[PDB]
């Protein structure tokens, strides 16, 4: 009656539905469905996974005697490397599950889906006649997703060095990463931490200031829509105290006295912070490390005077000697 191709093409591109489904959504839905469903089944009942290629597997499943804080989906074995490794690359299913294929399936499907999610955000904003670049803010978590699941494995040369999908898995990754690349002393993670503490601070401040200022808001509302005048009352006086202390410096730092820049600054601060730390983990995949201060101070008799950084380097040795089982004679390593 309207030629099913246009009924399909109307129904998809509709902005009248409960949840938008886009042209990107047509790729987002099966990839996310695969990733989610494989993760639930795997977090419950994935068989133990040989991850080092020594034939000693690491458990990760609730039914095998874990709770959820000790569970994880365990990355693929050290024999796989960067090889593509689908189901039909195994000659039986139980060796596929033993080699940690489920992890690879999940992480590829999720990465695809995340990019489609960003794409769909751009599409609805275009459709409703909005401004774009809410997705540009969303590229900050996508960037870190990329760095920790794709870029850091390629640099190290194996998908067995990626972040496990779990609670204790994530913390194990953090500990063994600090041990070898010394990231606290790397500036890009520092710009990241600054962004996150600053984001929390500016979030708290914005909430408190606005939520005392607003008295009441109102809009007339009808039986399926909203009204004609979005009305609000806000207080509009203040003292020279706050103007001379806080106001003078936000207006000087925006280099504009418009308060339009306030929300702008609000969006920009965590995002940029998180961009730089996403750069950190990427460049550290290519074995460029953070600072190390060793024997900064020695006396004039040739005896080293310790610093507060030497205590940290001792813990780096501590963690690192436990993280090689490979030989006693590991001389110069990675990669």
């Amino acid at each position: 009656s309207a030629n099913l191709w246009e009924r399909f093409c109307n129904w998809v591109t509709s902005t009248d539905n409960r949840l938008y489904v886009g042209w990107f959504g047509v790729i987002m839905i099966p990839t996310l469905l695969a990733a989610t469903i494989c993760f639930v089944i795997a977090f419950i009942a994935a068989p133990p996974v040989d991850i080092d290629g020594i034939r000693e597997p690491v458990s990760g499943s609730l039914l095998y005697g874990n709770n959820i804080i000790t569970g994880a989906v365990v990355p693929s074995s050290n024999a796989i490397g960067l090889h593509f490794y689908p189901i039909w690359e195994a000659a039986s299913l139980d060796e596929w599950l033993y080699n940690g294929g489920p992890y690879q399936l999940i992480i590829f499907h999720f990465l695809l889906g995340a990019s489609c999610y960003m794409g769909r955000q751009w599409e609805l904003s275009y459709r409703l006649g909005m401004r774009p670049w809410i997705c540009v803010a969303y590229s900050a978590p996508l960037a870190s997703a990329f760095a920790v699941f794709l870029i850091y494995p390629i640099g190290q040369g194996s998908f067995s060095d990626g972040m496990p999908l779990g609670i204790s898995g994530t913390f194990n990754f953090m500990i063994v990463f600090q041990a070898e690349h010394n990231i606290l002393m790397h500036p890009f993670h520092q710009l990241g931490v600054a962004g996150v503490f600053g984001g929390a601070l500016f979030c708290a401040m914005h909430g408190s200031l606005v939520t005392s200022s607003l008295i009441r808001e109102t809009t007339e509302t009808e039986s399926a829509n909203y009204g004609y005048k979005f009305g609000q009352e806000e207080e509009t006086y203040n003292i020279v105290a706050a103007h001379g202390y806080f106001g003078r410096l936000i207006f000087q730092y925006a280099s504009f006295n418009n308060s339009r820049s306030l929300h702008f600054f609000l969006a920009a601060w965590p995002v940029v912070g998180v961009w730089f730390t996403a750069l950190g983990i990427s460049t550290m995949a290519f074995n460029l490390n953070g600072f190390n201060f060793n024997h900064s101070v020695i006396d004039a008799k040739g005896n080293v005077i310790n610093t507060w950084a030497d205590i940290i380097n001792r813990a780096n040795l501590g963690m690192e000697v436990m993280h090689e089982r490979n030989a006693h004679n590991f001389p110069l390593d990675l990669a």
Binding site: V12, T13, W23, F24, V26, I27, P86, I87, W88
Partner: peptide, 26 residues
């Protein structure tokens, strides 16, 4: 088992074909 390999090629090309023949219809 290679019927599954065959099947996966078929069913995913089918979805990217929907996506891009819709993105050219606009």
């Amino acid at each position: 088992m290679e019927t599954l390999k065959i099947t996966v090629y078929i069913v995913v090309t089918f979805f990217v074909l929907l996506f891009v023949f819709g993105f050219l219809s606009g």
